[PDB]
């Protein structure tokens, strides 16, 4: 049954006449009658008297009672929703390399809103977009530039990786003035690492023999293992700058690997989301290259 | 909040996809998407997944529960006009320990209502609350006192568990006049299911049997396979028959609650009375 008609019937009783419901609802007296007749025709029963003060019939008393029940439900739901939104964390898919460099400043902005919470899911660039598409996150950092259906994209800047190692490690694999890339132990970030898979492209020509690999599945532990000579690795220039400045590591190579990054968020008129987006863009501007 | 849009979101979930809602509602696929977009802009959150099967987000669960509440009201109203008994299915989450002790008397009451059905779901504590939140059950017996969004809570009383074993089993694990709790085989209802204040230091490995039914769990203790924590209601006959003894004068007490949708529902009110009355008759204060 049409709940607007139920409301119309209720207004008639609460206000006492058809004209009273008309003025209360800001609808014509004709509209009230149309709704009542429809509801009565839908039910198969006469529901209310056309006299004044208006009295509900036996069947009509049912719908009036029902209408007040639905009115109470609607009000309780609105209040319940308002409170749950506050409690529910905004969900983001992000990669470890963004989280370990330029992103943490976003935390400051969310903290100042007063009660907001974040849920970060750590995913590589490719996997990140699927979480957005399916709706499991409201925003996502991704290498993919084309917008997924329902979402808008903003460019954040470019992430640069450097091939770094400790000076001692490099010298250990210098022979005849040329570096033996294949023999040099390398750091890998996970058992699935796309970067470390293609880390010799344009450094070695033919088929590569077997490598010496250590795996450290945290951005900071990964950097520490390189920092400490366990292997060379591809490290975000943000992370490498202090080690290079302190002379703990050196550049093995003037050839960076560049990855443009984007922010994708569901299109919704949410000021919460708008604020989060601005915070992300602003953080990436400060910690990525133009 | 537009009530038509709530129906559409619910249809997406019930039918499993946006296309399913399209066919179910006789509206274009574009209309389904437009209605969701509008509803999402009103809330400020994504409400349902764009995958199949469609799942409500955390925010979406609020609206889905609300939509199912409205469906229940509509059904009770239709039943009142009809001049015939309602025949409304009531879906409940319950724990095995309640179902096997104090709950069954509810069956008599529900049966007497004419036409109505029960769908009981036996669920662990965590999933039980999730079902309530998203609207997959309208009521639940639970150890959780804090109300899930959209629900009201009623205290039912306290469930007492006793640590029991057969005399022969206890004697078998007496060592120098002291019982070796860690070495004694124990019963468990599942792989996710007890020595706190029974052992001080580090616990070694245990020997565990798993029996995933309340009565077989009890039967295994009764028959010496292991000790276990058993509801005093279940244990009383075994204790009276001398089949088991108390390993411990300290019971473990668990307060119980009834959580129900906040709704002016005559079915829900009636079910609550039946549940509360059963708990009054078979649980401790
Ligand atoms: N060899 C490496 N440096 N691998 C880094 C993998 C980190 C991954 N791209 C992420 O940001 O989540």
Numbering used by the authors:
A (entry chain B): 1 to 290
B (entry chain A): 1 to 193, 199 to 290
Excerpt from the paper describing this PDB structure:
Interestingly, all attempts to crystallize LysG in the presence of l-lysine and l-histidine failed, but diffraction datasets could be collected to solve the structure of LysG in the free form [LysG], and together with bound ligand l-arginine [LysG + Arg] at 2.52 Å and 3.00 Å, respectively. The ligand-binding pocket is formed by the interface of the two lobes of the regulatory domain. Binding of l-arginine in the extended protomer of [LysG + Arg] leads to a small but substantial tilt of helix 6 by 8° compared to the conformation in the ligand-free protomer [LysG], which enables coordination of the ligand l-arginine by amino acid residues D124 and E125 in the [LysG + Arg] structure. Within the ligand-binding cavity of the [LysG + Arg] structure, sidechains of eight residues (N95, D97, D124, E125, H161, F189, D193, and F222) are located within a distance of <3.6 Å to the bound l-arginine molecule, potentially interacting with this effector molecule and the other two basic amino acids. However, since no diffracting LysG crystals in the presence of l-lysine or l-histidine could be obtained, blind docking calculations using the [LysG + Arg] structure and AutoDock Vina21 were performed, which predicted the positions of l-arginine, l-lysine, and l-histidine to be in the same binding pocket, with a maximum center of mass deviation of the top ten docking poses from the crystal l-arginine of 1.2 Å, 1.2 Å, and 1.3 Å, respectively. Two 1 µs simulations of LysG revealed two frequently occupied conformations with a reaction coordinate that can be exactly described by the distance between Cα atoms of residues 219 and 96, which are 6.4 Å apart in the effector-occupied (closed) RD in the LysG-Arg structure. Simulation of l-arginine in the ligand-binding site of both TRs yielded no transitions from closed to open conformation on the sub microsecond timescale when started from the crystal structure. Perturbation of the l-arginine orientation by 180-degree rotation resulted in an opening of the conformation, and a subsequent reorientation of l-arginine into the crystal structure orientation for both TRs.
